[PDB]
């Protein structure tokens, strides 16, 4: 049952296997595969309503974007500035800058930098030709400054379908569309987002390792006031079982998305994402939606994400009441030490 | 500086020392003495405003009650029912009955029982003559059903003085007057009350061991939803340093109150109270006042009792939100384990 992401899919026109195992990094934990279904399959709709991951193989959600690539985008993506993170390692740990205040002892592993698409493509072309070890990752929201063709393509997305999803799930509004363009091998460490996400793969292959909300005690997120809030403190490449013992009870659902696939990442679900090794650059556009609002009377017992919501709020409250985020830990410890533990 | 409660006071008329060391139980912790001052002494007023313990030797607060004793009280205290706790050991751990629901695995060490004063005096006279090991402790609020003379004596209390205290400290209303009549040797284990208290000694001698609010982590109170809420889990006679390590850093302020003394027990201050061994029965009447309300803008950093107030509230919140008090510990542990500890 630990098939992983399943056997490599066979490409149409006998073009060989899309990717192969050796492109996947190795980890200490087991994973079961995420269902790869058809948007017309009743099961998929079932999984989405039940807030469980699922790869939809035929939405045509971002059909017009499947022709995107560096040249095309550079050709007409606009003149605006694109946020670009650089890093020494293959892990791009996201950090909230507005929170960097609280922890003056945090050394960023990845640094951001604004630039023009053509600049990213160059910096990317240089390392690419000079064989540098440096890595880049473009993560920018799609604004107004967008090119004419890109705005055209954007209109070609399957809004009929996605909008109905927003309606059936009672979700809130579409908060944004993030454009991600990464280099083969790049990794986004495990974290959970507070919104519903439709992850539409465009170019290259990405391995997605998700974990359910109820595995909060195995993933050890950073403190809410820390810059790395919502990220796992556990280093998947070298898990510290002394500090993070329950990480040995972790079980994730995995899959490899390719051009045309849309992975539903339910709100609060942890996800670890990597661009296959030697798989070339990757392109993905995600859609973020505020989740549906809290029901009239909250039934019992609570769902795992509700508890996570509570914990998060308790930490924020103590942060304000105490007048200083760093006294949160001490107060919490004083509260349980010898009383609840 | 660990004088304890100081050297035994010499009684007027060369009637020898009021009490002696051998009447005091022995404990593993050190104590410094609580100032014994005059109500006219500026220092006392200073200590009260600063919310620090102090024994006031001359208030005449309960002057008329100094003539009380079993016969007198029985003679005219009324026909109402008096709450009476019985127990095998010398420790009368207070338990909140309304909370006994939450912990169906709690075995009461002391059992309550309503009865007529004359009944308490009898049950007390029997054990007293049959040399029983059983112990009793009368703890009853002074109601309306009070006798005529008792109501007279009550009027003789020094309201002028105490009322001014309530006014100077901005305290709230007098919530009640508890009448406590115990047997020599009886002990009330360390706990903290949420109100300002003026502890007026009437008959016999009581040793009072107080601890400041900031020693919360050394006294390990029971969970807020537990019946023994606000009591220390540490057994002073046999302290479990494995479960309660910080109990080895505990330092209390001590004193022995006698007829006529009034001990100010500041709100949230822990107190351990014992009737001297072979010292006869003890009588005390306390006065409970709601503390002053929270100031306009709360300055920083917070005072220790404010933090204790916060912790208490956090526990109550999780108790309601989770829909069940017993899930509080687990949620709290899941919150800090590997994140804040």
């Amino acid at each position: 049952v630990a098939s992983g992401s399943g056997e490599p899919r066979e490409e149409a026109g006998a073009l060989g296997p899309a990717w192969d195992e050796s492109q996947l990094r190795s980890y200490s934990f087991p994973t079961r595969p995420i269902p790869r279904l058809s948007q017309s399959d009743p099961r998929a709709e079932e999984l989405i309503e039940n807030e469980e991951p699922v790869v939809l193989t035929d939405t045509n959600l971002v059909y017009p974007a499947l022709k995107w690539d560096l040249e095309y985008l550079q050709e007409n993506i606009g003149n605006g500035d694109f946020s670009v993170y650089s890093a020494s390692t293959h892990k791009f740990l996201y950090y909230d800058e507005k929170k960097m205040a609280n922890f003056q002892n945090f050394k960023p592993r990845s640094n951001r930098e604004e630039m023009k698409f053509h600049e990213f493509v160059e910096k990317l072309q240089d390392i690419q030709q000079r064989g540098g070890e440096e890595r880049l990752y473009l993560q920018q929201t799609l604004n107004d400054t967008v090119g004419r063709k890109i705005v055209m393509d954007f209109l070609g997305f399957n809004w009929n379908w996605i909008n109905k999803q927003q309606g059936k799930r009672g979700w809130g509004q579409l908060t944004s569309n993030l454009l991600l363009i990464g280099m083969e091998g790049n990794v986004t460490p495990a974290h959970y987002d507070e919104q519903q996400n439709f992850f539409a793969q465009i170019k290259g292959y990405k391995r997605c390792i998700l974990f359910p909300p109820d595995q909060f005690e195995c993933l050890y997120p950073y403190p809410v006031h820390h810059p790395c809030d919502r990220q796992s403190q556990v280093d998947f490449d070298n898990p510290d079982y002394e500090r993070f013992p329950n990480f040995q009870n972790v079980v994730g659902y995995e899959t490899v998305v390719g051009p045309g696939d849309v992975l539903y990442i339910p709100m609060y679900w942890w996800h670890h994402i990597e661009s296959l090794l030697n798989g070339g650059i990757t392109i993905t556009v995600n859609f973020w939606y505020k989740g549906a609002p809290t029901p009239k009377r909250i039934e019992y017992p609570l769902k795992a994400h509700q508890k996570v919501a509570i914990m998060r709020n308790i930490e924020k409250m103590l942060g304000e009441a105490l007048g200083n985020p760093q006294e949160v830990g001490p107060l919490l410890n004083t509260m349980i030490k010898g009383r609840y533990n | 500086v660990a004088s304890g409660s100081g050297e035994p006071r010499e009684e007027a008329g060369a009637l020898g020392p009021a009490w002696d060391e051998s009447q005091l139980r022995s404990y593993s912790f050190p104590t410094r003495p609580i100032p014994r001052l005059s109500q006219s002494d500026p220092r006392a007023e200073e200590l009260i405003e600063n919310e620090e313990p102090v024994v006031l030797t001359d208030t005449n607060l309960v002057y008329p009650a100094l003539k009380w004793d079993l016969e007198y009280l029985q003679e005219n205290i009324g026909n109402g029912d008096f709450s009476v706790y019985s127990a095998s050991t010398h420790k009368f751990l207070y338990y909140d009955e309304k909370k006994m629901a939450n912990f169906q695995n709690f075995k009461p060490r002391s059992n309550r029982e309503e009865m007529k004063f004359h009944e308490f005096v009898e049950k007390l006279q029997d054990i007293q003559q049959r040399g029983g090991e059983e112990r009793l402790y009368l703890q009853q609020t002074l109601n309306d059903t009070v006798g005529r003379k008792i109501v007279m004596d009550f009027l003789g209390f020094n309201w002028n003085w105490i009322n001014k205290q309530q006014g100077k400290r901005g305290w709230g209303q007098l919530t009640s007057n508890l009448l406590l009549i115990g047997m020599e040797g009886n002990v009330t284990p360390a706990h903290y009350d949420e109100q300002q208290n003026f502890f007026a000694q009437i008959k016999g001698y009581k040793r009072c061991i107080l601890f400041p609010p900031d020693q919360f982590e050394c006294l390990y109170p029971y969970p807020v939803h537990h019946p023994c809420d606000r009591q220390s889990q540490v057994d002073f006679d046999n302290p479990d340093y494995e479960r309660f390590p910080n109990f080895q850093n505990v330092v209390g302020y001590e004193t022995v109150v006698g007829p006529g003394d009034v001990l100010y027990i500041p709100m949230y201050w822990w107190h351990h109270i014992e009737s001297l061994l072979n010292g006869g029965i003890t009588i005390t009447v306390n006065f409970w006042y709601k503390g002053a309300p929270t100031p306009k803008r709360i300055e920083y950093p917070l005072k220790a009792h404010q933090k204790v107030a916060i912790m208490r509230n956090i526990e109550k919140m999780l108790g309601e939100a989770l829909g069940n008090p017993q899930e509080v510990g687990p949620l709290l542990n899941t919150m800090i384990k590997g994140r804040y500890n």
């Binding site: 996201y94 993560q139 929201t141 908060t175 944004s176 993030l178 986004t188 974290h191 987002d193 507070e194 919104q195 996400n197 809030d229 919502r230 973020w288 505020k290 989740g291 809290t294 909250i298 609570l302 509700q306 919501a309 509570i310 998060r312 709020n313 308790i314 | 919140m317 309601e320 939100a321």
Partner: peptide, 13 residues
């Protein structure tokens, strides 16, 4: 309460 279990809307952006 229940003003407790409500969430926010933070994503890695």
């Amino acid at each position: 309460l229940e003003d407790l279990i409500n969430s926010h809307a933070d994503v890695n952006a």
